[PDB]
Design a protein around this ligand. Structure first.
Ligand SMILES: [O-]S(O)(O)c1ccc(-c2c3nc(c(-c4ccc(S([O-])(O)O)cc4)c4ccc([nH]4)c(-c4ccc(S([O-])(O)O)cc4)c4nc(c(-c5ccc(S([O-])(O)O)cc5)c5ccc2[nH]5)C=C4)C=C3)cc1
Ligand SMILES: [O-]S(O)(O)c1ccc(-c2c3nc(c(-c4ccc(S([O-])(O)O)cc4)c4ccc([nH]4)c(-c4ccc(S([O-])(O)O)cc4)c4nc(c(-c5ccc(S([O-])(O)O)cc5)c5ccc2[nH]5)C=C4)C=C3)cc1
Ligand SMILES: [O-]S(O)(O)c1ccc(-c2c3nc(c(-c4ccc(S([O-])(O)O)cc4)c4ccc([nH]4)c(-c4ccc(S([O-])(O)O)cc4)c4nc(c(-c5ccc(S([O-])(O)O)cc5)c5ccc2[nH]5)C=C4)C=C3)cc1
Ligand SMILES: [O-]S(O)(O)c1ccc(-c2c3nc(c(-c4ccc(S([O-])(O)O)cc4)c4ccc([nH]4)c(-c4ccc(S([O-])(O)O)cc4)c4nc(c(-c5ccc(S([O-])(O)O)cc5)c5ccc2[nH]5)C=C4)C=C3)cc1
Ligand SMILES: [O-]S(O)(O)c1ccc(-c2c3nc(c(-c4ccc(S([O-])(O)O)cc4)c4ccc([nH]4)c(-c4ccc(S([O-])(O)O)cc4)c4nc(c(-c5ccc(S([O-])(O)O)cc5)c5ccc2[nH]5)C=C4)C=C3)cc1
Ligand SMILES: [O-]S(O)(O)c1ccc(-c2c3nc(c(-c4ccc(S([O-])(O)O)cc4)c4ccc([nH]4)c(-c4ccc(S([O-])(O)O)cc4)c4nc(c(-c5ccc(S([O-])(O)O)cc5)c5ccc2[nH]5)C=C4)C=C3)cc1
Ligand SMILES: [O-]S(O)(O)c1ccc(-c2c3nc(c(-c4ccc(S([O-])(O)O)cc4)c4ccc([nH]4)c(-c4ccc(S([O-])(O)O)cc4)c4nc(c(-c5ccc(S([O-])(O)O)cc5)c5ccc2[nH]5)C=C4)C=C3)cc1
Ligand SMILES: [O-]S(O)(O)c1ccc(-c2c3nc(c(-c4ccc(S([O-])(O)O)cc4)c4ccc([nH]4)c(-c4ccc(S([O-])(O)O)cc4)c4nc(c(-c5ccc(S([O-])(O)O)cc5)c5ccc2[nH]5)C=C4)C=C3)cc1
Lengths: 133, 16, 16, 133, 16, 133, 133, 16
């Protein structure tokens, strides 16, 4: 897939992702906070179409993600992220996608997710997160 | 804590 | 060290 | 003076300041690095004119500031930053301004300056720096 | 803030 | 279980854990690095006995953990950590315990584990890790 | 002088220093906090005697240092730290020593001093501080 | 990187 790396910011204001219940997550875009002002990150798009869009608007700065979980599994021969769930101190967003395959979860006791990096071909191949106080 | 990232800040130097 | 700031990074999850 | 706060970034690429040898530092602007791309910070300008401009272009990322020093003193009844010197691992930039008053210096053994905040009326009233690994 | 230094903490995994 | 919290240190030199292939992880103790000197953490012991001991001696500071993975599952009605695997830049230690239940994994691209906290009753109930640059 | 480096800890509980009004600071010792428990640092002593001792007991964790200032100057041919002042959110401790020479000051807007390093021959030659969130 | 944790360090002040 096509690798992307948004880098580190001051916080997260909005997450826009898309998915298809028969396959996996497709598009991924984040609106970050950059020292108090919104910073629109690059839209990381799948090579194909046919994904329902989802908008997660956080009540920044009072609402922030405390846990990210999901599933990775095989789709057409390759391992991809098939599902994602975002839990904030306010509520749970998701699951979005297919909850099948191998689960993973990253609960955070102290700290904040301040950035994302990953790769997308037809679907989200993998992803990593920047953490900071 | 809030959802805003923190950094060490030193200063200020000059008019207090 | 270089002049680029560093951050903790966890992952990746998905295709290794 | 008029307070300003650029916030924290990933590094510093260029510093643009101005001064007058009879008074103090006037204008202050920084070109930061934001995850590998230049990010032009707001130009913080003095209310008056009559300052010689200085451009400090750093060979980012191999060159970075290791020490900031200067002088604070009285100009027309108020305390202001009258002089600044920037020392990198490559060379020394300055002193710029008037080296009179009370000296101050911030040598850094480990870490990086990643942002500035302060206030400017007719001159740079004061300033603080964001530090990070 | 208090005078106690902070660190990022991830988890817990196991009994919630 | 009995909660424990070693806190944050400068690095990890040695990990001592115990387990039983029919149940879960039992004892857990860590020798940390504290500014260049070994710091022996408190031995966190299970209320019962019958666990094979394991010693993981890291070639500190050149060898450090890059991924922690394991399984959590039900043992006698309660959720516990049944298995743990430690992968360093040098080799893989484990799996130790029973690889059954729900998997979890924490790969680290940048940063270090510098501390542990958790709880142990008959077995390791749960655990969290301190991360730092 | 004889170099020393206490390293980084979780906080500062007590500072013990000594000085002589005709020369400079002599002995320096710190009681740190290490994850909630006191950790007595090594006593860094001057080669000579004749210094009045000072004990600075902080009401940890509610009281913490916000500014360190002092003077460096010449004593018998060499540059040494002649004076130190510690200002916390509660009160000011000092000045201790001789307020003559070149001043220096480190005000902290956000962050904590979590460690000291330096060198002592007959007097405190120099010192550096570890800062952290 | 090595397995030793890092911290910001400012200074030194005094004999250079
Ligand atoms: O080691 S392994 O064997 O495991 C192994 C692991 C991974 C791979 C794959 C791979 N891509 C795949 C699809 C794919 C195919 C079929 C199906 S399926 O048939 O449907 O199942 C599903 C998915 C796939 C679909 C679309 C893309 N890949 C796109 C892409 C995205 C968006 C656009 S765009 O912009 O036009 O929209 C254009 C192009 C890209 N892929 C790269 C790219 C790359 C180039 C240079 C550099 S670098 O050198 O760093 O510069 C870094 C990375 C790589 C490197 C390896 C790699 N892609 C860059 C763009 C499937 C596998 C092969 C073998
Ligand atoms: O370990 S092994 O040795 O065995 C081994 C491991 C990995 C590889 C692969 C590989 N690519 C694959 C697909 C693929 C095809 C079909 C299916 S399938 O359908 O499932 O069959 C699945 C997957 C695949 C699909 C699309 C691309 N690759 C695209 C790409 C991106 C964007 C566009 S664009 O612009 O048109 O959008 C067009 C094309 C690129 N791939 C490179 C590239 C590269 C070239 C030069 C330089 S350098 O000269 O150094 O700079 C740097 C990097 C490499 C280097 C190795 C490599 N790609 C550059 C662009 C499948 C395998 C081969 C052998
Ligand atoms: O406590 S003390 O007694 O010590 C004490 C400390 C500080 C002050 C001063 C002060 N300003 C001075 C000059 C000045 C005067 C004379 C000479 S001299 O005669 O030459 O010597 C030199 C310098 C001076 C010159 C220009 C400005 N100040 C400009 C300014 C800059 C740029 C433009 S622009 O954009 O048009 O270019 C427009 C306006 C501003 N000043 C503020 C401002 C402020 C408003 C709201 C908010 S907030 O509530 O937070 O919103 C925060 C801050 C304050 C608050 C206090 C304050 N300014 C905002 C803009 C001199 C003193 C008074 C008393
Ligand atoms: O401790 S005390 O009690 O004694 C005490 C301490 C501080 C103060 C001062 C003060 N300002 C001064 C100058 C000044 C004048 C002359 C000289 S001199 O030449 O040297 O004499 C030196 C310094 C000075 C110059 C310019 C300004 N102040 C401008 C300003 C900025 C930009 C423009 S603009 O837009 O035109 O560019 C126009 C004007 C502003 N000042 C405020 C402001 C404020 C108002 C409402 C609200 S709120 O309603 O809450 O929102 C929030 C904040 C306050 C609040 C207190 C305060 N200013 C808002 C704008 C000098 C003192 C008074 C008493
Ligand atoms: O909400 S829920 O319903 O989900 C729910 C969740 C959790 C619990 C349990 C629990 N302990 C269990 C075993 C157990 C029983 C049976 C089997 S089995 O039958 O084999 O399956 C297996 C395991 C179990 C075995 C041994 C212990 N617990 C020991 C212990 C360890 C070591 C020693 S020692 O030192 O002597 O060795 C002595 C004592 C302790 N347990 C606590 C303790 C505690 C006290 C005060 C404070 S605080 O207020 O903060 O101070 C904080 C924590 C709690 C709080 C809740 C709690 N323990 C302190 C010591 C099983 C469940 C109940 C309900
Ligand atoms: O949500 S609910 O409302 O439904 C609800 C939720 C949770 C609880 C439980 C609970 N403990 C349990 C076991 C248990 C027993 C048997 C099995 S089983 O075998 O599987 O059946 C499984 C689990 C269990 C086993 C051992 C202990 N608990 C021990 C303990 C530790 C160490 C020793 S020692 O010293 O001897 O080693 C001795 C005893 C303690 N437990 C407390 C304690 C406490 C008291 C006072 C104060 S305070 O006054 O405030 O300070 C602070 C904290 C509480 C408070 C609530 C609570 N324990 C203090 C010590 C099972 C449930 C009840 C209701
Ligand atoms: O480049 S320059 O020219 O500028 C230049 C800069 C610095 C120096 C000095 C220096 N020491 C001085 C006094 C001194 C003399 C006279 C007066 S005065 O006459 O009164 O004015 C005042 C002060 C002085 C007094 C006591 C000591 N020094 C003691 C000491 C302390 C405590 C004990 S103890 O434990 O017994 O109490 C025992 C011994 C030590 N000094 C070292 C040491 C060292 C050894 C190995 C290693 S390493 O290789 O890393 O291992 C690292 C460091 C060095 C390295 C350079 C150096 N000391 C180790 C212990 C005065 C200057 C010379 C030239
Ligand atoms: O740039 S130049 O080239 O010009 C240049 C720069 C620096 C130096 C100096 C120097 N030491 C001085 C004093 C001094 C003396 C008198 C006065 S005065 O009174 O003012 O005159 C002022 C200052 C001075 C006083 C005490 C010591 N030095 C002690 C010491 C510590 C502890 C004890 S103890 O144990 O007894 O307590 C005993 C002795 C030591 N010094 C070393 C040491 C060293 C040796 C081997 C190895 S290695 O083999 O590699 O391991 C590593 C390090 C070096 C290497 C260079 C060096 N010392 C080891 C121990 C003055 C200068 C020379 C030339």
């Amino acid at each position: 897939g096509k690798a992307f790396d948004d880098g580190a910011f001051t916080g997260i204001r909005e997450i826009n992702l898309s998915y298809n219940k028969e396959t996996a997550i497709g598009d991924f875009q984040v609106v970050y906070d950059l020292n108090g002002s919104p910073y629109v990150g690059q839209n990381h798009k799948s090579f194909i179409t046919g994904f329902t869009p989802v908008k997660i608007s956080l009540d920044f700065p009072s609402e922030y993600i405390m846990e990210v979980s999901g599933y990775t599994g095989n789709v057409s021969g390759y391992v991809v992220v098939r599902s994602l769930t975002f839990k904030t101190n306010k509520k749970t967003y998701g699951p979005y996608g297919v909850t099948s395959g191998t689960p993973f979860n990253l609960p955070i006791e102290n700290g904040l997710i301040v950035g994302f990096k990953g790769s997308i071909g037809y679907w989200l191949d993998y992803f990593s997160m920047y953490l900071s106080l | 804590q809030s959802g805003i990232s923190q950094t060490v800040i030193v200063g200020p130097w000059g008019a207090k």
